[PDB]
Amino acid sequence: EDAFRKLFRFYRQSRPGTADLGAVIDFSEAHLARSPKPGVPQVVRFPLNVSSVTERDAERVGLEPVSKWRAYGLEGYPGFIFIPNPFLPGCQRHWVKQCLKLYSQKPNVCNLDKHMTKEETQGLWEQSKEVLRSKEVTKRRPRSLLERLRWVTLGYHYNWDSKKYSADHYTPFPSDLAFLSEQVATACGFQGFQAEAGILNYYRLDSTLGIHVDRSELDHSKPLLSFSFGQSAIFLLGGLKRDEAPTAMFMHSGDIMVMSGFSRLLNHAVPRVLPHPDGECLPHCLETPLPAVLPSNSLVEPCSVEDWQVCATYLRTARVNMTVRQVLATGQDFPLEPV
Ligand SMILES: O=C(O)CNC(=O)C(=O)O
Ligand SMILES: [Mn+2]
C-alpha cells in the first residue's frame, strides 16, 4: 500500500462532515484566504487573459466574463488550474441536459453499446421521463438506461481495450461543447485548442475512478479540460510516479480543471463522490433556472420543465464529468500503418 493507495482508500471510506475531510482543499472558499492547514500545498491565484475572450462569446456558452473568474494553482503542481463554477446562473442546466439527453445518443459511443442494440438504447430518455410521470412508481425497479450509463466518448472515440485513439473511429465533436472548451482554453492562455476527443463519465454515489495518467493523446503539450456537474467529488492529484502522495481537493458543480504543462501527465483519481449533506438534494447552483430570454445566437439552449425534471432527479445521486482533449499535434496526423 503506497502513499496513493492509502489516501485513495481513506477518502473512499471517509465520513462526510467529520474531520476526515479537513485536509481536502476547497477552492470555492479560497477567496476567504484562510491560511492553509499544515501538510497541505498552498493555493495561489492564477491570472487569466481577461481580454482574450469577449463577454458575448463567454455568454454564448453560459460563462461569466473572464474578468469575473477566479482561477487558482497549487504550489508544487505547475500547470494545474482550477476554476470554481464560472457559469452564468442556470447555465449548468444546459450542459447537464446535453450530457444526459444529447451526447448519450447515437451516433456517439457509450458503455451500453457493446451488449444493447440501437433500438434498445434509443428509448433512454423517454424511459426516464415515463418513470417520473407515473403513479404506480416504485416496485424495486431495475436500473434505468440513464442509470446504467457509465461513459460516453465524442470526437475520436477512445478505445478502452487498446488504450489508443484512431482515425478510423470518429464522430464529429459537438460544436457547442467545442466552443465552450475553446473559450476556457483561450482564457487560460491556450488559444488554438482543438476539441478532438471527449470522454464523459457518469458517477453514481458509489462510483470510483482509479489511479491513472491521461497519456493516450498524441500531443502532451496540450491542456486537458475537465468539467464537473452535480454532486461533489474528492479528487486526488498526485505525481509523475504512481506512489507519490497526492493532494485532495473538492470538485463541486460547475468547477473546471485545466491540467496543462507539467500537470498534464500527473497521476490522479477520484476515490469518492460525496452525497449532498441533506441527503438526496441538488447543490444550490443547480436550483437557479435558465434566463427567460436567452441572448441572440446562444449556444446555451432553453431547457424544458419536463427535461429538467429528469436531470434534477438524476443529479441528486450522481455526478457528471466532461473531459475534452486535443489528440493530434497541429500539423500531425495519426501515422499511417506499414505493411
Ligand atoms: O472524474 C473526474 O473528475 C476526473 N476524470 C478523469 O480523470 C478522466 O476522465 O480521465
Ligand atoms: Mn484522467
Residue numbers in the entry: 20 to 358
Provide the publication's sentences verbatim:
AlkB family of 2-oxoglutarate (2OG or α-KG)-dependent oxygenases are evolutionarily conserved and implicated in nucleotide demethylation. Mouse ALKBH1 protein has 389 residues and consists of an N-terminal extension (NTE), a nucleotide-recognition lid (NRL), and a C-terminal double-stranded β helix (DSBH) domain. By establishing a reliable in vitro enzymatic assay, we demonstrated that ALKBH1 prefers bubbled and bulged DNAs, instead of ssDNA or dsDNA substrates. Structural studies of ALKBH1 in substrate-free and a 21-mer bulge DNA-bound state revealed the molecular determinants underlying the observed substrate preference, including unique features of a stretch-out Flip1 motif and a functionally indispensable N-terminal “α1” helix.
